[PDB]
Every structure is written in C-alpha cells, then in structure tokens.
Amino acid sequence: PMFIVNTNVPRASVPDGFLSELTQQLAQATGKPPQYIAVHVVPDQLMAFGGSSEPCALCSLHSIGKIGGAQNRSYSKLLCGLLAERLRISPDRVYINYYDMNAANVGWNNSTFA
Amino acid sequence: PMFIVNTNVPRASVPDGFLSELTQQLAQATGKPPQYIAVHVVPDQLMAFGGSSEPCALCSLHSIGKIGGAQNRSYSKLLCGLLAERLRISPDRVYINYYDMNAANVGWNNSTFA
Amino acid sequence: PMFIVNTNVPRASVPDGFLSELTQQLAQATGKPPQYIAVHVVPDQLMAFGGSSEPCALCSLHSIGKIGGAQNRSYSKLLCGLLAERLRISPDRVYINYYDMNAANVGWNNSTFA
Ligand SMILES: O=C(O)c1cc(-c2c[nH]nc2F)ccc1Oc1ccc2ccccc2c1
Incomplete structure (x- = not known):
C-alpha cells in the first residue's frame, strides 16, 4: 500500500518518527x-x-x-487521528482519497503485481 | 471538490489571491x-x-x-483560462485529469462521505 | 502519456538530461x-x-x-531500468501506478480529448 500526505504544516512540525509510525500503523490496519x-x-x-x-x-x-x-x-478514523495528534490538523480539514488498484496496474521490481 | 496544480512556473509568479480565486471560481463552476x-x-x-x-x-x-x-x-475552459491569465501558461501546455470519486472512497472528519 | 516520479533522491543526483531522456524513451515505448x-x-x-x-x-x-x-x-521494466541507471534506485523500491484515462476525463487546451 501507498499513503501520501500533502499539507501546509511546516517541515519542522513533522515529528521525527512520523514516517515510521505511519508505516507501522498502516501495516496493522491493512493487514x-x-x-x-x-x-x-x-x-x-x-x-x-x-x-x-x-x-x-x-x-x-x-x-x-x-x-x-x-x-x-x-x-x-485512524489517519485523521494520527494527523490530529502528530501534525495538529483538525479532522474536518483532511481529505483522504481511497483507490483500489488492480494488481496489473501496479508496477514494481521491473514488472507488475499481476 | 479538490483541485491540484503542479507547475514549473516560479513561486514569485503566483499572484496574491490565487488560491482564493481558484476556490471561488470552482465554487461558481461546480455550484x-x-x-x-x-x-x-x-x-x-x-x-x-x-x-x-x-x-x-x-x-x-x-x-x-x-x-x-x-x-x-x-x-x-475555466481552469486553463485562469492558468493563462494568472500564471501565463498556454492552454495547450496544460493537462487536467478528472476523477469522479465514489463517496465511500473519500475520507473526511474521521469517516467518509458514504 | 503523463509520467510522474516522486523520490527521496536529492536534486543534485538527478542527472542533466533526465526529463528529456524520460520523454524520448516514453515516446519510443508507447509509439x-x-x-x-x-x-x-x-x-x-x-x-x-x-x-x-x-x-x-x-x-x-x-x-x-x-x-x-x-x-x-x-x-x-523500462522505467525501473531508468530509475536504477540514472537515480540509483533499486527496482524493488519503486511503485508505478498505471491509470487508463477516458478521453472525456483528460483536459487540455480549454477542452478535453473526447
Ligand atoms: O498518450 C496518451 O494516452 C495521452 C495521455 C494524456 C494524459 C494526461 N494526463 N493523463 C493522461 F492520460 C494526454 C495526452 C495523451 O495523448 C493522447 C491524447 C488523446 C488520445 C485520444 C485517443 C487515443 C489516444 C490519445 C492520446
């Protein structure tokens, strides 16, 4: 899976360990x-x-x-919670677009996941 | 609605009020x-x-x-016009990808719009 | 087509000519x-x-x-090859999401391609 966050919050306000926390939390959530x-x-x-x-x-x-x-x-709920606690962004000012990708449409390691 | 513009135009060339004009004119266009x-x-x-x-x-x-x-x-027509007028980008050097999102696939405020 | 790369590789490690090489190689591959x-x-x-x-x-x-x-x-294979050769990114640390766009959903030059 792939999670992208674009935000106006400045670089210094992104905690160290935020990327690792997102990785772990998403691994749990996506199974x-x-x-x-x-x-x-x-x-x-x-x-x-x-x-x-x-x-x-x-x-x-x-x-x-x-x-x-x-x-x-x-x-x-998970991701807004993390954005609220870590970046101090209110949940009602977050959009998350979800995309269900077909395996043949995801390239990786010189091929696809098909 | 969510509108994103990526451009090689420099930051200094984006005029004051541009984000607000985009919001207003998208509100006018989409109702x-x-x-x-x-x-x-x-x-x-x-x-x-x-x-x-x-x-x-x-x-x-x-x-x-x-x-x-x-x-x-x-x-x-609207968005190319705005990009031409405000950022001096020719309409024939603009691509705009349109996405019709399912409400179940847009997260906001700890939930989705479904 | 439109090809976008987001990477943690620094700007100075992107070789001169990289955008042009991508353009030529994509033109070649897609005919x-x-x-x-x-x-x-x-x-x-x-x-x-x-x-x-x-x-x-x-x-x-x-x-x-x-x-x-x-x-x-x-x-x-093409794009992982280029990212490996030019940016020194291992192919197994690359994701490429492929999108088949409907002509009605791509804007250009004040209209769409429909
Ligand atoms: O090569 C493409 O498929 C292509 C893709 C984009 C594009 C921009 N953002 N997302 C996109 F997919 C833009 C122009 C393109 O050239 C055209 C344009 C219209 C076409 C109509 C019919 C058949 C082939 C066509 C090819």
Missing part, C-alpha cells in the same frame, strides 16, 4: 507486511481548505484490495 | 459550497511538456459527481 | 510523438518504502488507453 507499505509526507504546501489556509491535509491511500465502505471509514 | 473546496498549487516543479521546459501545468480535479463530458470541457 | 508526453520529477521527498529511507520512488503513468497487463510490465 499487510510493513515491507510493502510506502509513505510520503509533503509539508510546506500552498493549499487551502474551504478558502482557509489554517492547517489542512490532502491525502491518498492506494492499495491492491483492502478498500471499501467500512475499511475506508476505519482508515479515515 | 458546490466553498467550504468543501480544497485547492493546492505546487510551483517550481521540474517538468516538461512535449519535451519542452516552457511554462506548463499538470493538474487534477477530483469531485464526488459533477464529472462528465460537458462538465469537464467547461472546467477545462 | 507516440514526444509532443504528447509530459514528464514530472520531484526529488528531495520525505518518504519511506517498507519503513526504510534508502533510495525509493513512487510514480504514476497516465495514458488514454494503451494500458494493460503486458504493456504495464514492459513499462515497468
């Missing part, structure tokens, strides 16, 4: 070994949520399967 | 309240369009519905 | 004129792959058709 989990945090972004430049985040989670109604609700 | 509109502008990018490093932009617009043939043509 | 190819490289990213901060890349390739099992494998 996948941490070796397949990729995380990407992009601070200092020029963005607005509802016309406002208060702290916000635009995120995505891509996974081959393990994507759906209840799972996405549980991921949103 | 949707400005409170749920998210905008993100990423200048100074290393990119090429047709092998040339003249000003260009790679964009995306995600919406839960309000995506389709006529609507996307209308959004393209 | 398309280089005028249709857009490329975007984002170095210096805060990212991990499997909890490790060794060199890695998170990429996407968007195309209007010409996406599928065999073609995606061929693209992965």
Whole structure:
C-alpha cells in the first residue's frame, strides 16, 4: 500500500518518527507486511481548505484490495487521528482519497503485481 | 471538490489571491459550497511538456459527481483560462485529469462521505 | 502519456538530461510523438518504502488507453531500468501506478480529448 500526505504544516512540525509510525500503523490496519507499505509526507504546501489556509491535509491511500465502505471509514478514523495528534490538523480539514488498484496496474521490481 | 496544480512556473509568479480565486471560481463552476473546496498549487516543479521546459501545468480535479463530458470541457475552459491569465501558461501546455470519486472512497472528519 | 516520479533522491543526483531522456524513451515505448508526453520529477521527498529511507520512488503513468497487463510490465521494466541507471534506485523500491484515462476525463487546451 501507498499513503501520501500533502499539507501546509511546516517541515519542522513533522515529528521525527512520523514516517515510521505511519508505516507501522498502516501495516496493522491493512493487514499487510510493513515491507510493502510506502509513505510520503509533503509539508510546506500552498493549499487551502474551504478558502482557509489554517492547517489542512490532502491525502491518498492506494492499495491492491483492502478498500471499501467500512475499511475506508476505519482508515479515515485512524489517519485523521494520527494527523490530529502528530501534525495538529483538525479532522474536518483532511481529505483522504481511497483507490483500489488492480494488481496489473501496479508496477514494481521491473514488472507488475499481476 | 479538490483541485491540484503542479507547475514549473516560479513561486514569485503566483499572484496574491490565487488560491482564493481558484476556490471561488470552482465554487461558481461546480455550484458546490466553498467550504468543501480544497485547492493546492505546487510551483517550481521540474517538468516538461512535449519535451519542452516552457511554462506548463499538470493538474487534477477530483469531485464526488459533477464529472462528465460537458462538465469537464467547461472546467477545462475555466481552469486553463485562469492558468493563462494568472500564471501565463498556454492552454495547450496544460493537462487536467478528472476523477469522479465514489463517496465511500473519500475520507473526511474521521469517516467518509458514504 | 503523463509520467510522474516522486523520490527521496536529492536534486543534485538527478542527472542533466533526465526529463528529456524520460520523454524520448516514453515516446519510443508507447509509439507516440514526444509532443504528447509530459514528464514530472520531484526529488528531495520525505518518504519511506517498507519503513526504510534508502533510495525509493513512487510514480504514476497516465495514458488514454494503451494500458494493460503486458504493456504495464514492459513499462515497468523500462522505467525501473531508468530509475536504477540514472537515480540509483533499486527496482524493488519503486511503485508505478498505471491509470487508463477516458478521453472525456483528460483536459487540455480549454477542452478535453473526447
Ligand atoms: O498518450 C496518451 O494516452 C495521452 C495521455 C494524456 C494524459 C494526461 N494526463 N493523463 C493522461 F492520460 C494526454 C495526452 C495523451 O495523448 C493522447 C491524447 C488523446 C488520445 C485520444 C485517443 C487515443 C489516444 C490519445 C492520446
């Protein structure tokens, strides 16, 4: 799986160990070994949520399967919680886009997961 | 709706008010309240369009519905116009990817929109 | 097509000519004129792959058709090869998400490709 966070929160406000914490938390949540989990945090972004430049985040989670109604609700609770506690971003200023990827459409190690 | 612009135009060339203008005009275009509109502008990018490093932009617009043939043509006219006027990027060096998101696949405020 | 690379590799390790090489090699592989190819490289990213901060890349390739099992494998070999040779990223620390875009959902030059 792949989790990306774009945020206007500055680089110095991203705790050391945030990437490792996201990796571990997502491995637990997706039921996948941490070796397949990729995380990407992009601070200092020029963005607005509802016309406002208060702290916000635009995120995505891509996974081959393990994507759906209840799972996405549980991921949103998890990830907003982490963004609230660690980056001090209110949950109502976070979007997370979920993508269920087909294995043939994910390249890795010179081939795909097909 | 979420609008993201990635561009090789420098940060100094993005005028004051640009994020607010994008939010307002997307609100006008989509009819949707400005409170749920998210905008993100990423200048100074290393990119090429047709092998040339003249000003260009790679964009995306995600919406839960309000995506389709006529609507996307209308959004393209609007957004290319704004990019041409404000960032001096030619419309023929802009790509905009449109995504019709399922409400179950958009996380917000510890849940999703389903 | 449009090809985007996000990587923790520093800007100085991206060789001169890299965008042009990507454009030419993608034009070659897809059998398309280089005028249709857009490329975007984002170095210096805060990212991990499997909890490790060794060199890695998170990429996407968007195309209007010409996406599928065999073609995606061929693209992965090509693009992993380039990232390995030029950026010294191991192929098993690269993800490439492939997207088959509908022509109606790609904006360009004030309209869409529909
Ligand atoms: O090579 C592509 O598929 C292609 C892809 C993009 C693109 C930009 N963001 N996401 C994308 F997928 C843009 C132009 C392209 O050239 C065209 C454009 C229209 C076409 C219509 C029919 C058949 C082939 C076509 C090829």
